[PDB]
Design a protein around this nucleic acid. Sequence first.
RNA 1: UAGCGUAUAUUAAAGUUGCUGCAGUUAAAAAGCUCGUAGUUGGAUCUUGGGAGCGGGCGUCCCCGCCCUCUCGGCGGGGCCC
Length: 186
Amino acid sequence: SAKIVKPNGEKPDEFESGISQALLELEMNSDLKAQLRELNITAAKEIEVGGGRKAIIIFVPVPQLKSFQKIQVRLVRELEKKFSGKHVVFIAQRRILPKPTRKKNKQKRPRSRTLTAVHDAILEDLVFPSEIVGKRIRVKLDGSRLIKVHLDKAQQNNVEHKVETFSGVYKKLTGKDVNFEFPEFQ
RNA sequence: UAGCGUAUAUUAAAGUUGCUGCAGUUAAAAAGCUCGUAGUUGGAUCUUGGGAGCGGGCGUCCCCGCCCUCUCGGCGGGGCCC
Ligand SMILES: [Mg+2]
Ligand SMILES: [Mg+2]
Ligand SMILES: [Mg+2]
Ligand SMILES: [Mg+2]
Ligand SMILES: [Mg+2]
């Protein structure tokens, strides 16, 4: 199988040729080759979400992430059309660096490579057509904390059915749980 | 009570020297006012929940083990190892 668009660490292409092939007959399409041949993906997951629903996550290099962000809605529309019954999200590959403890000549860890910043950026990239307008993290009496994220109320018609997939994906690849709301206009 | 009084130094009483812990309108006590160097003090932000068996009951509690590094390992190149 032609796997030309998937750079990796070195090796792993774990039967996820489906996304590469799908992009490959998203070749010869309408007005999408001016902005798709030069940029590619790193990895893809087919995690379980909610009930029997399935969502697929696509990991992208960061400058290539911004270049996906400019054309994401069209590509995700027909790629969901091909992969019927599943939801597609685009996430960067973010490279968290560990916190330096008291244990040769290491460099200063960038603030964007911290886990807090990475989780914030992941939450921002996960919901792309809508914009985050607030955060209402709440400690519920047990030491456990639930995050509540407010979306921009201008893409509610576009994205209101994916919120449980967003919650499942964010629980899967970050570990904490979120809810999504659409407040009245500010 | 075989002891008891007096003088003086000193401690508690004394939160009447105050770190714990005092005061400063009118009782004693805020500089006429502003700048200012030592001194003293100084906003928020970079690892957290799922983690590995013993684990105060995987019992959604958790004795608790976290699922630092590499040049000779010495129990020029075999696993039993440090
Ligand atoms: Mg005294
Ligand atoms: Mg007094
Ligand atoms: Mg007076
Ligand atoms: Mg000074
Ligand atoms: Mg501070």
